[PDB]
Design a protein around this ligand. Sequence first.
Ligand SMILES: [Zn+2]
Lengths: 52, 122, 50, 86
Amino acid sequence: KAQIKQALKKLYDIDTVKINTLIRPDGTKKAFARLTPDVDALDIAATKLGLV
Amino acid sequence: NGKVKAGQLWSKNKEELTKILGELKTELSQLRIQKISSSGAKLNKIHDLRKSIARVLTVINAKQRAQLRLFYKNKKYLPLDLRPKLTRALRRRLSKEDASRVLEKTKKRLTHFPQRKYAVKA
Amino acid sequence: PSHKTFRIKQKLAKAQKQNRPIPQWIRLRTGNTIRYNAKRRHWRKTRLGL
Amino acid sequence: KGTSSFGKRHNKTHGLCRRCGRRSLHNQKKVCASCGYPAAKTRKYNWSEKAKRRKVTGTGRMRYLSTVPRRFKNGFRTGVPKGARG
RNA sequence: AAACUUUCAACAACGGAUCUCUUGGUUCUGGCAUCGAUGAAGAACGCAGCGAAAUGCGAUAAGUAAUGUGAAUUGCAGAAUUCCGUGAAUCAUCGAAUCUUUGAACGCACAUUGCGCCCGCCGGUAUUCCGGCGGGCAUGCCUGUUCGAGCGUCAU
RNA sequence: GAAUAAUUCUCACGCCAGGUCGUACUCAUAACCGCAGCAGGUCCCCAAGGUGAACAGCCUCUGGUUGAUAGAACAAUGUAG
RNA sequence: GCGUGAGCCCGGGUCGAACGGCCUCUAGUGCAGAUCUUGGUGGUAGUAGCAAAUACUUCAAUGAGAACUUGAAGGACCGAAGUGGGGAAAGGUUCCAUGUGAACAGCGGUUGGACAUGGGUUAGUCGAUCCUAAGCCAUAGGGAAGUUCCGUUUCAAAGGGGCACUCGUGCCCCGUGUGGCGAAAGGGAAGCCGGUUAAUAUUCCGGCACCUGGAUGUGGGUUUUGCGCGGCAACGCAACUGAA
RNA sequence: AGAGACCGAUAGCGCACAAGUAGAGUGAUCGAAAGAUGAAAAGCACUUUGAAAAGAGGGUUAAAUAGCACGUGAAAUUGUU
RNA sequence: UGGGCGAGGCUCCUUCUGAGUUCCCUGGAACGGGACGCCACAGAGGGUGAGAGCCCCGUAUAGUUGGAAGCCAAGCCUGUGU
RNA sequence: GUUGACCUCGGAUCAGGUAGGAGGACCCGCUGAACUUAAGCAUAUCAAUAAGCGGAGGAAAAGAAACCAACAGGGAUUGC
Ligand SMILES: [Zn+2]
């Protein structure tokens, strides 16, 4: 979790409040990231090329 | 875009080699973001970009090794990876000068009575 | 059981991963003889050794 | 004995071994019944010729030993061919 | 007289013998001497535009550099090159690199992705606490260096 | 360790942080072991109303099933009552 | 058609690439049996049989096709040491949605734990991680030609605590003792309610709390009799120095 | 690397094929079956019956008496005449 | 009785090598049958729609283009007695 | 007394080094059976062999006489 939080700030300049992780049955890792209340996440998904 | 030809990569310095690697790593991740739910000519770019990073990486490593070998010339001890690797058995044989030494009394006989060149007639 | 270990957890992922049929375009190559997957494993038929 | 006594079987004598990958590691003894772990030697006996061939050299990847014959043929040389660029 | 049982022929069934074939075996003769702490043999997990296996490779991952040849690959698509030169290919050769977790396996352990110490850099008010990155810490023995023990022992 | 402040006050309030792996579903007259969707075997928790000495036997409420190849006839000989 | 005989030759049909006569040489050279070896097929035969655990019925819908698919209405069983609601060992995707020709579900099948394509398991507080038990294995040493056997404090020079230096490299104390592994049922710091998804929650959202470790400021307390007062007492209060 | 008075898919090594594979056993270990369309897929357009699988016409080919259950197709056993 | 030169030869890899698609018949296709020719220090073997010396890869003979590293050695040039 | 030597025995993450494992067809050693034959069986035979253990190379091992001989004397080792 410590490395994941660092990566997002350096690469998408977005801040988070907490991260939760799990390991899927196929063997890959999935992480949920929650953003600070003042920042909006819906627009960041659009502007950071995420499909919307 | 296109390939990064290895021809012009050799005439560069370390810093600008590191710089070009910066953008190269960038859009590869960025293009992987939108590869989902779509497929076209952009799929040729991932195979294009993946190999392009490989070429510049080898050039940087190769350039470092050549300059490092120059530093350790005329030195008794040099790092393990820069030492020649032939074979475990071949690295422990006696050197040529050591296996060719002879005693003083043996050399005295060999100097005065060597093998001669002769022929016998019928 | 619900209590597992990472080694057993890792081992079960691969066993499930290599359990799907062959793609269709394989049988259309030249000089091909493969007909079907011959290493099919089913949880009610064969017991994999952990 | 029989079917009635076969239902009481829910334990494990052996587990996975770290050196050979077979499920032949005695849990209580902590020694492998196939490769002899943790002993330095690997188990091997002459009264079974089939067992020796199942794990003899050449049944795996041979990551390093496969390229030696090509290197000997050229005399274990180093360098680059004459006027190569670089 | 039909039905039923049995024998033979024609055609149609079940089954895979016979004849012909072979990128496979077997035996003899001839040439050579090359694993590993500079991490071997073996094991595990991963990598393709569309892949499960086999084959190949290791986060530089169905390959990279360099030399030669001189226009492909092919199941589909896409582009790439087009020989000016800036060069196709699952090509041939091979002298420079990368090389995850393990294994004689080496910080202590392992039925655990467990628990420590030393040195340096960057952050949070920080020589002591927390996080990230890089380099180290197994045993026997040989030569030398250095610091020591003993009324064993010599001279003031 | 103080006389003009100091304080090693276990009192009240206030600032920062807390890494790694497991978590789906069955646990059995169909998901485990007996060659199988086998009348066998396999460790624990919770425990309503009536009769009654009672976790005995018989009927009911919450909750759960209506699943075990079927239709027609009623000779001998059988298994169970 | 020929020959006493083992056998040889020809006519007709099918098929598609190699094959004979004569004299010598050579051998893994001739089958009905061995409860012979491997593969294939019959009579028995549409026969034995598919009978434990009380039991089914009416209408409508879907569909090529309904006793064993779905809805409603009747009739029944299990009867809290349950055919209910949750776990340990073991299994490993069997969980959820959509669709479906063959095969399987010892009758059927539109249904399924089967087939095909997608989705699903979030923790400072629940466990592992820490400690030892029966027990196992290194170290000092002794046996054995050797793979190795014994030995666990034993005939061992076996450890750990503080300070200051520009800077690590300089000082000063104590010393009987000095390893690791081993429990999801033993010992153990800390979280509750309401809602939410087709499929997860003491984890997600909302509200209200707690524990450990590390830094620091205000309020109050104590002190010029330097380290607090009260009650006869059992004792009391928001604090109220304490190394070997 | 070169050869044979050697074997020719029940033979020759256990393996001419994704063979030390699939599979069995707690374990040491045990361990198979499976080669051949045609010179070239030219692997049957279109119409019609059927819920569908498929059938009847019509096509490719020297040949479909070669249709992915595919060269040649014997005996045991079976159907029609 | 020291030192230094050294032609020339031998190992390895790589460039190149002779002759019919002439005419007629059968056949889906001549690599079959008939007639007429050529090459051969090359009539070993394989492919190409059926048995191919002359369609293609190769095969026999000495040479030839280019390159790398070790050997052997004909014969020459120079010091000298502590 | 102070100080300086010698001998023996130790510490160190001191500087530089070296051994383990694989393979084992052939080769150098140790250890060591029984089935079988003798028409029974115990010495004997199978056999100074199979299994077990240690150590090397492209070959290994052996080897320049405390030898053979009795002759008019031969002259390291290995193989046919
Ligand atoms: Zn093992």
